[PDB]
Amino acid sequence: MPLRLDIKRKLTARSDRVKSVDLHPTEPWMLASLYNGSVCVWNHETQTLVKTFEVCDLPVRAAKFVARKNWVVTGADDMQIRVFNYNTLERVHMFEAHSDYIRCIAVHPTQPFILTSSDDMLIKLWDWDKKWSCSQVFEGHTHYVMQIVINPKDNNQFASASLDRTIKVWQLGSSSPNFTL
Amino acid sequence: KKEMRILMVGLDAAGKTTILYKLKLGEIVTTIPTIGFNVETVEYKNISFTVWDVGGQDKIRPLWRHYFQNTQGLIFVVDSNDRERVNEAREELMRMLAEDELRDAVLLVFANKQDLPNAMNAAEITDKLGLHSLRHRNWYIQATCATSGDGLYEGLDWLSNQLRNQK
């Protein structure tokens, strides 16, 4: 039976090409990463642009809120991950994560972990409590890893989608995928 | 190729099915408790090992006797982290080893889950299972991690050499 969803437009933000969007859990904010290398925070209640981060001159393909730390984590085509405090607009940290474009960032919901996927065919786990050390590298995709998502029911598992035509499900703590779809 | 029939038994959650598919597919299969048996053929050094993974649940343990016939090698898998059920694993192993149909069967014990920090070492499992009390039986204990695959091939290499010399 057709679900009668009342679809209302809350915000319309015209900008350059948006490559990632994220929603803040407590604040009425939308994060938008742009192809021009900027990251914008929109308030969807006031319909106003609240914050803008100029990351680099290159496309920012991934951006995520880390609400518990007051951070915005960005991954750009310059192979750099940049961490910004969204209150002070200060750059907290910056490091080279991958040898090619960063496609996706997944933030672990409870642990101090960020997963990053890249066109280098790798997925890397970063621990921010250990000075952003790479704790693990996941190898096994044969093409660009376009998106990664943590299992909301089992935060030790995540899935990856790749241009190799495969989906791999991985476990934190395993260098090999649990299975391939 | 010489075909060898191997029975793989042990308590539930010992990781038997994980060992079987790690040997065959090279991958870690997340297994639910095996309700019944799995049968897979594993090739190692021109010997075809037909491995029977029979479930270790209390309801299935009485049914292990139906698989003893024509068994040339017995693999007993022990959860080296399960200190509470080690005595139960000893009783079940000793009960199987008393069967006349298994008299000529070579015993390989896999001390599995050695990757866990509270795992008993292979020597502690050897004493707790009483393997040193076994007379006239060729046995070997190998520390294994079914998830990494460490020690699985060393155990199979011992088994292949024993079964090659028995004819």
Here the CATH number for the domain that contains residue B133 is 3.40.50.300
Tell how strand A113-118 and strand A123-127 pair up: antiparallel
Question: Edge-to-edge strand order for the sheet containing B106-112?
Answer: B37-44, B47-54, B2-10, B73-79, B106-112, B139-143
Residue range(s) defining the domain that contains residue B141: 1-166
Other Cβ atoms within 10 Å of A148 Cβ, number: 22
Q: Return d(Cα B139, Cα B73) in angstroms, integer.
A: 10
Contact assessment for residue B5 and residue B72, using Cβ atoms and an 8 Å cutoff: yes
Sign of CA dihedral B29, B18, B118, B122: negative
Chain A nearest-CA residue for B149: A176
The strand pairing partners of A40, in sequence order, are: A32, A52
Count Cβ atoms within 10 A of the Cβ of residue A111 and give its class: 0-12 exposed, 13-18 middle, 19 or more buried: middle
Q: Is B162 a catalytic residue?
A: no
Q: Return d(Cα A61, Cα A147) in angstroms, integer.
A: 11
Contact assessment for residue A105 and residue A149, using Cβ atoms and an 8 Å cutoff: no
Q: Return d(Cα B146, Cα B151) in angstroms, integer.
A: 8
B contacts of A178 (beta carbons < 8 Å): 27-28, 30
What H or E segment, with its residue span, contains residue B17? helix B16-25
Contact assessment for residue A145 and residue A152, using Cβ atoms and an 8 Å cutoff: no
Of B135, B164, B154, B166, the C-alpha closest to B23 is B154
What H or E segment, with its residue span, contains residue B153? helix B152-165
Other Cβ atoms within 10 Å of A61 Cβ, number: 21
Cα separation values, A150 from A128, A156, B72, Å: 17, 8, 45
The strand pairing partners of B5, in sequence order, are: B50
CB-based contact, B25 to chain A, within 8 Å: no
Contact assessment for residue A175 and residue A138, using Cβ atoms and an 8 Å cutoff: yes
Q: Return d(Cα A149, Cα B123) in angstroms, integer.
A: 43
Contact assessment for residue A149 and residue A116, using Cβ atoms and an 8 Å cutoff: no
The count of structural domains within chain B is 1
Sign of CA dihedral A45, A49, A55, A56: positive
Q: Indicate yes or no: CB of A174 within 8 angstroms of CB of B28.
A: yes
Contact assessment for residue A28 and residue A48, using Cβ atoms and an 8 Å cutoff: no
